[PDB]
Amino acid sequence: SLKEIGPNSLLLEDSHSLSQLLKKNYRWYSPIFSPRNVPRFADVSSITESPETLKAIRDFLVERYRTMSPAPTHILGFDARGFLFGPMIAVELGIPFVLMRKADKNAGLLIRSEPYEKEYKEAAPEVMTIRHGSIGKNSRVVLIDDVLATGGTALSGLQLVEASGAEVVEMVSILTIPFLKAAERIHSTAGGRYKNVRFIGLLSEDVLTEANCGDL
Amino acid sequence: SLKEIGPNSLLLEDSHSLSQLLKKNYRWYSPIFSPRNVPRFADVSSITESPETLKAIRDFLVERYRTMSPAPTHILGFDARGFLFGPMIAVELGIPFVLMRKADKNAGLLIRSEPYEKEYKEAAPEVMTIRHGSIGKNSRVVLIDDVLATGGTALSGLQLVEASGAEVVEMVSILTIPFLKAAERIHSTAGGRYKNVRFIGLLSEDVLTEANCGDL
Ligand SMILES: Nc1ncnc2c1ncn2[C@@H]1O[C@H](COP(=O)(O)O)[C@@H](O)[C@H]1O
Numbered sequence: 001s002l003k004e005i006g007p008n009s010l011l012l013e014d015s016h017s018l019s020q021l022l023k024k025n026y027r028w029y030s031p032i033f034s035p036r037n038v039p040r041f042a043d044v045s046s047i048t049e050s051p052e053t054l055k056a057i058r059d060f061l062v063e064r065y066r067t068m069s070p071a072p073t074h075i076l077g078f079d080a081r082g083f084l085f086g087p088m089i090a091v092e093l094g095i096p097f098v099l100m101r102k103a104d105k106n107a108g109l110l111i112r113s114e115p116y117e118k119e120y121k122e123a124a125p126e127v128m129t130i131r132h133g134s135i136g137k138n139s140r141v142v143l144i145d146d147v148l149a150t151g152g153t154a155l156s157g158l159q160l161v162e163a164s165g166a167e168v169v170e171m172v173s174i175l176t177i178p179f180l181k182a183a184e185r186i187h188s189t190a191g192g193r194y195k196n197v198r199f200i201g202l203l204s205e206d207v208l209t210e211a212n213c214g215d216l
Numbered sequence: 217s218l219k220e221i222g223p224n225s226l227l228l229e230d231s232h233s234l235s236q237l238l239k240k241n242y243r244w245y246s247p248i249f250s251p252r253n254v255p256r257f258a259d260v261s262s263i264t265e266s267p268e269t270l271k272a273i274r275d276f277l278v279e280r281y282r283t284m285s286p287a288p289t290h291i292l293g294f295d296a297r298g299f300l301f302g303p304m305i306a307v308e309l310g311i312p313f314v315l316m317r318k319a320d321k322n323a324g325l326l327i328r329s330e331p332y333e334k335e336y337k338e339a340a341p342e343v344m345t346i347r348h349g350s351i352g353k354n355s356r357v358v359l360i361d362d363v364l365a366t367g368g369t370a371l372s373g374l375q376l377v378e379a380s381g382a383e384v385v386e387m388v389s390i391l392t393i394p395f396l397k398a399a400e401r402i403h404s405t406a407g408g409r410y411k412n413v414r415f416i417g418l419l420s421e422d423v424l425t426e427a428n429c430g431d432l
C-alpha cells in the first residue's frame with residue numbers, strides 16, 4: 001500500500017512485494033554504459049525482462065484502478081517507455097490507451113504542450129502532443145511513464161489532459177526521483193493550478209545502490 | 217486461424233473476429249494528417265484506443281504461444297510501437313520482453329544490426345540494437361512490431377537474434393503490407409539464410425479502404 005512522502009505524493013511502502021521486486025531487479029548504468037548524460041540511467045528493460053516484476057506491476061495497478069471510484073476512463077502513456085506499461089493495464093480495465101508523443105511521431109490533428117523555459121545550461125524541454133479528441137471532455141485520465149525525474153514530461157501530460165477538458169486521476173511512474181522534487185514543483189507551478197494532482201511512485205531512486213549497477 | 221498467402225507468410229483469415237475488429241477499427245492518415253511521407257499511415261493508436269481490439273490481439277497471441285511447442289522463451293519488440301503489444305503478451309506467458317532500439321536509446325553493452333544499402337532515392341535503413349546477453353543462446357524469440365512494410369526493421373531483429381546464437385520463432389505484426397513483399401524479400405536475401413523465418417500478419421493493408429481514413 002501507498003504512503004504519503006509529500007503532499008499529493010505517494011510511494012509504495014518498501015515491505016510490499018512489488019517494492020522488493022523492483023529494488024531487486026532494477027538495473028542502472030553510468031554514462032559510459034548508457035545513452036544519456038545522467039549519473040544513473042534506470043534501464044526499463046531490467047523491469048520488462050523480469051516476468052515476475054512486470055506481472056507484479058500489472059497486477060498492482062490493475063487492482064488499484066478496478067477498485068478506484070470513480071474509475072479511470074483512459075490511460076495516457078508517454079513515448080516510449082510509458083508504452084511498455086500502459087497497454088497491459090488498459091487491456092484488463094477495458095479502457096483506451098492513448099499515446100503522448102512528439103508531433104513528428106503522432107498522427108492526426110494534434111494538440112501540443114507548452115513547456116516552461118529551460119533552467120541553467122539545462123535540459124531542453126520537449127514539446128509533446130496527443131491527438132485532438134483522443135481524450136474526451138470529462139475523461140478521467142491516468143498518466144503513466146517509467147520514470148518521474150524533473151516532472152517536465154509529466155507536466156506536458158497534465159497540460160494536454162486539461163486542454164482537452166478532462167480530469168487527471170494521477171501520474172504514475174515505476175521509479176521516482178525525490179531529489180529532483182517534481183511533485184513539489186508541479187504543485188506550486190502556475191499559481192498552484194496543479195496542486196491537486198496526485199503522484200504515485202512504485203520505487204524511490206534513493207533505495208537503489210551499486211548492487212543495482214548494471215555496468216560491466 | 218492463419219492461412220498461408222506465401223511461403224512462410226501467414227495471415228489471419230478474414231472471418232476471424234480479431235480480423236473483423238482490426239478491419240473495423242484501424243485508422244490511417246494521408247501525409248497532411250500524419251508524421252510521415254507515406255500514402256497511408258496506419259495509426260497504432262486506432263488499435264490501442266479500442267479496448268476490444270487490443271484485448272482480441274492479446275488473447276489471440278497469448279493463446280497462440282501458450283499452445284505452441286516448443287514455447288517461445290522471449291518476446292523482442294521494436295521501438296516504439298512494438299512496445300505497445302509485446303509486454304501484454306509476455307506478462308501472460310511469464311517470459312522476458314526485450315527491447316530493440318536505436319543505440320542512443322538503449323542501455324548497456326549493445327549489439328548493432330547491419331542493414332543493406334538503401335534503394336533508389338529511398339528510405340534510409342535504421343541501425344537497431346539489443347543489449348548483449350539480453351537474448352541467450354538457444355533462446356526462441358518472437359519478434360513483434362505494429363507494421364511489416366519493407367521488412368528492414370524485421371531484418372534487423374533477425375540479424376540480432378541470430379548474432380546472439382538464438383532462434384527466431386516468428387515475426388508478428390498487427391498489419392502487413394503484401395505489396396511491399398517483405399517476407400518474399402527476406403526469404404531470398406543473403407542466399408536464403410532466412411528462408412525458414414515464419415511471418416505472421418493479423419491484417420492485410422489491402423483490406424483497408426477509405427472507410428478506414430481518419431483524415432478530417
Ligand atoms: N535517470 C533516468 N533513467 C532513465 N530514464 C530517465 C531518467 N531520468 C529521466 N528519464 C526519462 O525522461 C523522462 C522523465 O524525465 P522528466 O521529464 O525530467 O520527468 C521519462 O520519459 C524517462 O523515461
Ligand SMILES: Nc1ncnc2c1ncn2[C@@H]1O[C@H](COP(=O)(O)O)[C@@H](O)[C@H]1O
Pocket residue numbers: 254256257258259294295296297361362363364365366367368369370398
Ligand atoms: N504505412 C505505415 N503506417 C504506419 N507505420 C508504418 C508504416 N509503414 C512502416 N511503418 C513503421 O515502420 C516500421 C516498419 O517499416 P519497415 O522496416 O519498412 O518494415 C515499423 O516500425 C512501423 O511502425
